[PDB]
Amino acid sequence: ALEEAPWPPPEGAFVGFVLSRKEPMWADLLALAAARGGRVHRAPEPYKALRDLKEARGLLAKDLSVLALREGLGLPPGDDPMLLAYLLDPSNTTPEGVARRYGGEWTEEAGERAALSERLFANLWGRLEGEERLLWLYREVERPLSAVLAHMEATGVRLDVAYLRALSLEVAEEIARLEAEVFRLAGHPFNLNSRDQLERVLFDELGLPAIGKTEKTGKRSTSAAVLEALREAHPIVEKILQYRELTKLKSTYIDPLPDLIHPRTGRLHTRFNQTATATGRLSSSDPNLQNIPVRTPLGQRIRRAFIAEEGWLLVALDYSQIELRVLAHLSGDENLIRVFQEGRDIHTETASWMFGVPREAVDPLMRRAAKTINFGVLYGMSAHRLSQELAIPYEEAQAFIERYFQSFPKVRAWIEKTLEEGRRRGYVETLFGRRRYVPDLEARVKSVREAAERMAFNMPVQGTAADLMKLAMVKLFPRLEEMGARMLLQVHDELVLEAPKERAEAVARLAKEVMEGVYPLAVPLEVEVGIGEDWLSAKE
DNA sequence: GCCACGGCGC
DNA sequence: CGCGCCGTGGC
Ligand SMILES: [Cl-]
Ligand SMILES: [Mg+2]
């Protein structure tokens, strides 16, 4: 019947809002409305109307809370049916999609969004009845985490603009060097960024052997996997690979970052999304912190650009081998649990079991083999891939994988048990009961079935790691406020804080303690911590 | 501007 | 070895 009533709404109303753009830190609030009992109240002047609300309840509540924080309003996010939908099925990642699946329509009008939010919340809440683990995640993780994320996004991080100018110049000079040499080898200029023009140069003009097709166009692929095979076939190949590496880094993590510095705050406001991934891991965007290269000289150079405010320090905390520890816990493998209890270098210790030698006798290459499998086993890394990674024969790679499962037989069992669970129930679950649906486990084509199988036993591990971190963020947040410290970034199994230099050390001790004790496992949780004026220094 | 796409990073 | 990111090329 569409009851309209004057602004302001009664307490408990769901909010609907329209932004000029999707990024709340950069957007104008174009419209605000609230709904309760289906009765809609539309705000005459949105910004003024914000201070009437006591919390943001509704779709994308966190995003409205971010914009409110920018304006200096304390408007914490509360109930949001996105969070409910994501717990019901993590393929539910957007309002549009949630509405299309469960009822109603995501439109561009505030009042309609508010009414929809209220409807969907009631709907999805009923759908969750009796799902006590998922409801626990909602109350103890998702809802309170949304408030942490709002604060992190609104706070942002300071960038070293002088450093970024210098890094940009350095990389530009090396890129120019490389493309000069490519054009020399090629005999003319062409657009290096064009895979079409590159294909013609490599395979038509230079006559190099093609290998793989492109996914859809059917052309001769110029991908890294193809070039890798040809590194010796022609010196231009190596140069192109270096060019692509640097250009990706510059175009993604050097050129965009200064443009992302907000004119009002002077800081970068990375956006955090808690309903975006299949596993329950948080995601970041503008920039995506997850895709900054790891363990290359280049990745390091990017993190150096992230700095503390003057008189402050960054505190970086990292859960050491958390996914393997989780695998130990879920599988119950006594030998792997022993690896973590006899706690020296974990990969050396894994190698000593694998190869049946004392830890003293493990050489660095043996350790690398163990390290590589400790991560590959989590997603069913093939012998073929391991063979490329370690540069060993295929048969030897096979033997290494078998050694691993021979020493850790309950890991082998756990993988198979998890697949049985997925095939029986149609879903798999984390330690805390976060759930992922895995329909293709019973597929016709083996190609898709194997991808489904990897997804199936990988998610419980990644998802458990994800929720340990999120639970730690929730526990840690209010205690940081006590100290005048703040939470800035989260990526992988790492958390970055900012604190006054006088309190950095105490903040580090406190954060370490809370993270390591967030939940008891069969093995200890270990947190590496460092302090520095920049993120790279603080990783040290 | 829109899009699908190859390519690359985790 | 799903998803966010880049620039390209068609519209
Ligand atoms: Cl937008
Ligand atoms: Mg051009």
Helix (H) or strand (E) holding A393: none
Q: Indicate the number of domains in chain A.
A: 4
Burial (CB count within 10 angstroms: exposed 0-12, middle 13-18, buried 19+), residue A453: buried
Last residue of some domain: A90, A121, A154? A154
Q: Which of strand B's nucleotides are less than 7 A from any protein C-beta? A: 4-10
Same domain for A164 and A131, yes or no, is no
Using the CB atom, is residue A224 less than 7 Å from strand B?
yes
**Cβ contacts of residue A170 below 8 Å, gap of 6+?**
none
CATH number at residue A532: 3.30.70.370
Same domain for A295 and A253, yes or no, is no
Question: Is the CB of residue A275 less than 8 Å from the CB of residue A283?
Answer: no
Same domain for A135 and A171, yes or no, is no
Same domain for A228 and A193, yes or no, is yes
Same domain for A420 and A526, yes or no, is no
Same domain for A142 and A1, yes or no, is yes
**Cβ contacts of residue A26 below 8 Å, gap of 6+?**
A262, A269
A365 half-sphere exposure, CB direction, 13 A CA radius: 4
Instruction: Specify the 3-state DSSP secondary structure of A263.
Output: coil
Query: What is the spatial distance, in angstroms and rounded to an integer, between the CA atom of A167 and the C1' atom of B8?
Result: 21
Q: Separation of A301 CA from ligand 2 center, angstroms?
A: 29
Q: Which of strand C's nucleotides are less than 7 A from any protein C-beta? A: 1-9
**Cβ contacts of residue A33 below 8 Å, gap of 6+?**
A15, A16, A17, A40, A41, A42, A43, A110, A111, A113, A114
Instruction: Specify the 3-state DSSP secondary structure of A490.
Output: strand
Distances (CA, A) of A119 to A39, A61, A299, A403, A505: 12, 15, 45, 55, 48
Question: Is the CB of residue A525 less than 8 Å from the CB of residue A305?
Answer: no
Same domain for A439 and A470, yes or no, is no
Q: What is the distance between the alpha carbons of residues A32 and A115, in angstroms, rounded to a whole number? A: 12
Residue A146 φ then ψ, to 5°: -60, -30
Pick the closest to residue A237 from A276, A192, A268, A270 (CA basis).
A192
Query: What is the spatial distance, in angstroms and rounded to an integer, between the CA atom of A396 and the C1' atom of B1?
Result: 53
Q: Which ligand is nearest to the CA of A193?
A: 2
Using the CB atom, is residue A215 less than 7 Å from strand B?
yes
Q: What is the distance between the alpha carbons of residues A87 and A134, in angstroms, rounded to a whole number? A: 6
Q: Which bin fits A291, alpha (ψ -120 to 50), beta or left (φ > 0)?
A: alpha
Same domain for A127 and A7, yes or no, is yes
**Beta pairing, strands A39-42 & A29-36:** antiparallel
Question: Is the CB of residue A138 less than 8 Å from the CB of residue A83?
Answer: yes
Q: Separation of A321 CA from ligand 1 center, angstroms?
A: 37
Using the CB atom, is residue A276 less than 7 Å from strand B?
no
Q: How far is CA A92 from the centre of its chain?
A: 17
Same domain for A258 and A231, yes or no, is yes
Task: Tell me how many helices (H) and strands (E) chain A has.
Answer: 23, 14
For residue A121, the enclosing domain spans 1-154
Last residue of some domain: A412, A437, A465? A465
Burial (CB count within 10 angstroms: exposed 0-12, middle 13-18, buried 19+), residue A316: buried
Same domain for A279 and A216, yes or no, is no
The identity of residue A99, as a single letter, is A
Identify the residue whose tokens are 């390091």: A300
- Strands of A299-369 (E only): list them: 306-307, 312-319
Structure tokens at A224: 């890294």
Same domain for A457 and A475, yes or no, is no
Q: What is the distance between the alpha carbons of residues A205 and A236, in angstroms, rounded to a whole number? A: 13
Q: What is the distance between the alpha carbons of residues A275 and A83, in angstroms, rounded to a whole number? A: 7
Same domain for A19 and A84, yes or no, is yes
